[PDB]
Amino acid sequence: WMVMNMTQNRVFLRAINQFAEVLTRFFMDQASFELQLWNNYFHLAVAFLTHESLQLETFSQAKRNKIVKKYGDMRKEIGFRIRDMWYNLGPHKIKFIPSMVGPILEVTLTPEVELRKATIPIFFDMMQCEFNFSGNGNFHMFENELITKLDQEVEGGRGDEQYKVLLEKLLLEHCRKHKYLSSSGEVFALLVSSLLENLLDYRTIIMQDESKENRMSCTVNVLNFYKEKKREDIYIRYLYKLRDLHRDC
Amino acid sequence: MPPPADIVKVAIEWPGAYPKLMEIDQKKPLSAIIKEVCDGWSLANHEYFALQHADSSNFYITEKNRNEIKNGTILRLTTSPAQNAQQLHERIQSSSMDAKLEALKDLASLSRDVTFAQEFINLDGISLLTQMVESGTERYQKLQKIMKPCFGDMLSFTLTAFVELMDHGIVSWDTFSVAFIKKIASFVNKSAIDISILQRSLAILESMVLNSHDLYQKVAQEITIGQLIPHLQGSDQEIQTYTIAVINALFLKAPDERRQEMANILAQKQLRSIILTHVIRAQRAINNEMAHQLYVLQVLTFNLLEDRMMTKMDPQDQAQRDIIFELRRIAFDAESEPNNSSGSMEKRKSMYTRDYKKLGFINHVNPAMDFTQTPPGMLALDNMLYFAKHHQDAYIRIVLENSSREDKHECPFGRSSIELTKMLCEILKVGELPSETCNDFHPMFFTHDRSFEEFFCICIQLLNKTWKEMRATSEDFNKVMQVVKEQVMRALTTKPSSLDQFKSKLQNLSYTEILKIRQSERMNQEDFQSRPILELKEKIQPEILELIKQQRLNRLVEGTCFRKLNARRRQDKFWYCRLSPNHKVLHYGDLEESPQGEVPHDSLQDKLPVADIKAVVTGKDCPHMKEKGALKQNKEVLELAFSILYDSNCQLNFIAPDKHEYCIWTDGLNALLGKDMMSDLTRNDLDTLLSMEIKLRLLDLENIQIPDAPPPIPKEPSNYDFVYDCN
């Protein structure tokens, strides 16, 4: 009963919208307390956002045509509401990080572009807020698990290359919009894009016939990434994978 | 700059002589052409030669039809037409009978000109012919029993000349005398005449009827119904057409009272029964002239109904009141007591209103207001009288049916009958002149002399049945009209023979199944061969064959259990040959007894260069079948041989379970070679896949006929100016 499901998702969107509007009505700057529920709130928001998407309906164009004729895409307004709420949210984003890192990944790697175009500046805003928090030191504390979760997402099979290119264009724009820390952010993003295309090659060759040399070069590249970025977890696990492959070869 | 056309080539032949050429310009007057011809050929007496065409026409050159002159045509010279007329006149009263025969034969054959006919008649030809016919009445009697055939043939030729002269009307109307009619009557009265003479005489009679009216009365005074019926006994269709045409001529310009009289005579003689048993049951080559005969006889029956229905039934007639009283007595003996038959008029009016308020009549004081409009007028009264006479059971059922209609959708019998009569008159084109080209014929009009009434009864009964099934409303009058028109047209196109069989086949017919089966047959034939349809499927073949090859390759990747050669001494006969998931290498070799199938691993011969494979020989050219030692294979596997040849010294010979799997394998191998397929199953699949695709695509053209000729290319503006923005 796909029609039942889509109606249910529409009313889920309506429920989330009224949640947002009541939160705006009586959870403003005075209500800096009891904000821990926003964590699970947006967790559920993304958990709802992560179904009934383009690749789900990709089997026949008729499904896409009929759904855009009757409802239109709802994940688009999910992202729009999320981004406007984050714009109106406030400077307490620091506590969001260890929680908000996971959810924003899926919307980061959306199959579409335009909503991703409108959504990318959230990364610029969170990076400048991360500098606000971490001026007394460095600010790896988002990028590390950002790369890790990117790592996990592409392992799930949702990586893309022209998406990177667009990412790089956007972050070049952001660095032009910023000051001396722009060099830091842009080299970080260079590492991000290079490792992402590394894993793109890994995924596009792990389905093709085994070659065992381009993958190994990519893996030593990720090793360089991890050792330069002061991270070890996925580093040790992927060198474990390297040892497994050696054993197999 | 087209080349000038003032110079043309034309050879003028002679009978028994070889041709001579000259340049002839037709724009100049014929006098100049004659002068130039005589000057070129050095011939005197230019007035004693003329020009005629030696083609199939065999006519002379006329100012109106000289355009047939084209370069490179046989043209032989003849003498001048004046000299031809003079010699014919001299030889008319000659001493040689063969000369007379040939001269009259030529005269009749070359009797297809008008102006030359004028010139010949200017020589008192008609007067001389009349004089020799009048004086020849007793002259040929002595030699009649000697040369009846030749004399009859000459008479036929002269009558043909007379007919064509009358058609051109060159002879005057008043010049006709009673001698011609008397001679034709004498010809008819003879009992030893041939079939052709009778046909010519009846043609003369019908021409006489078409000319005037009093001569029609004269011939009808000597016309009996008992002599034109034996003409029907003849199996020839032409004589039947002639007799029917003369019969129609009898109904052309006669008073309507005599029309009814002779119609009653035909009915009492039961002409339609013998017509049905003679011409309808014949399965010979039906002529379009007979179709015209059927159409004009249908028109005659329609006029015989109209001349009695064209008048308006006066509501003030007491006889009409008595007739409708008796009709409603014999119709409504369910609600009306029998005592009202001899009763007063108050109960008559009470029954009128109580029985017409259930039949959609508004006025209750003057019930006969609806009987002043024709068609049909009183035809409905005749139909209901016939219903009471023959269908009294159905009549009573219908009487008890409409009055019991509780669905608030009672059908007005009078209004529906008027509408149906109007539709029938419109579809049958009542009141128009007969067509000169259309040859539609309905053989069911000859089943009964009252055939139209039977047809209308069957139609109204079918309509009542269909309406009872549907229970129609007042909002689908257009639907009712269109469905009845379509069913009537479909019934007419079926060409029925008998009334009962026609009515049964009306119910036996499906819901336009003929159109569907015809469309399917046409599509199948176009698939076999067509100019504007067959090229469509063969034009677009990029995906069907490619995906067939993909399916074959997927069949190769999954693989199956194969068989080995000479595996009788501890050699396993189960093994696998799996294609790479990249579709470039083959994994095959010596394996074990595997009922499960293929085991995923590297085989003994894990490599097979597909670019080094030359071809796959199919049949008796496989080297492994050519051993003369001890490893000979069975003749039973002659259908199971195929070898992958490479290196010119090593052969990959494989064994198949049965035919279809080997066909699959050889199709896969050629697909690796990128060639055509060699499987009956593929051909079995090739037809349907294309058939399925075009069956899908034909829905856009459904209800729309596809033109055969290529549509033209209409002009387009040169500019790309967009009044409405693109995208």
């Binding site: 089997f59 026949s60 008729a62 | 099934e469 549907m470 639907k479 269109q482 469905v483 379509e486 819901y511 336009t512 199944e513 569907k516 469309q519 504007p532 349809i533 090229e535 469509l536 034009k539 677009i540 995906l547 399916q551 997927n554 349907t688 399925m692 075009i694 069956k695 899908l696 695509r697 034909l698 829905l699 856009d700 053209l701 459904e702 209800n703 729309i704 596809i706 033109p707 290529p710 549509p711 033209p712 290319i713 209409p714 002009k715 387009e716 503006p717 500019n719 790309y720 100016d721 967009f722 009044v723 409405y724 693109c726």
Partner: protein, 139 residues
């Protein structure tokens, strides 16, 4: 290719047969190539073909069968009987899905399913051709 007017009475652009290659944008159009035309000209029509909705193709009027009917078949009273032509158009959509069905039906051998599907779709197209014209009682 000038004088193009917006119009909504030509959505069902019925072809005839494989069109000539005189125009680069025009190809050997298939039988079911309904052109969703958004421009009106006296002797030509350029619109979006069903196979490629993103590519325009200029088509002659003599190559276009006049179909004023829209997807809504009651506003213009095109229906032979009300409430039937929506069924035929949803059936057309169903068969356009049947296209991708039999396209994906050959990836895996479904011989029993494939043959019974052949029989069912045969009866389907038979009944569609049967009810191409609505002239039967409502039952």
């Amino acid at each position: 290719m000038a004088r193009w007017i917006p119009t909504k009475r030509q959505k069902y652009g019925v072809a005839i047969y494989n069109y000539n290659a005189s125009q680069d944008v025009e190809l050997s159009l298939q039988i079911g190539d309904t052109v969703h035309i958004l421009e009106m000209y006296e002797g030509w029509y350029r619109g979006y073909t069903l196979q490629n909705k993103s590519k325009k193709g200029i088509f002659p009027e003599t190559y276009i069968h006049l179909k004023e009917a829209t997807v809504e078949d009651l506003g213009q009273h095109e229906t032979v009987i009300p409430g039937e032509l929506p069924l035929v158009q949803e059936l057309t959509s169903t068969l356009r899905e049947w296209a991708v069905i039999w396209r994906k039906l050959y990836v895996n051998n479904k011989l029993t399913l494939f043959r019974q599907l052949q029989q069912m779709t045969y009866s389907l197209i038979e009944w569609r051709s049967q009810i191409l014209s609505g002239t039967l009682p409502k039952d």
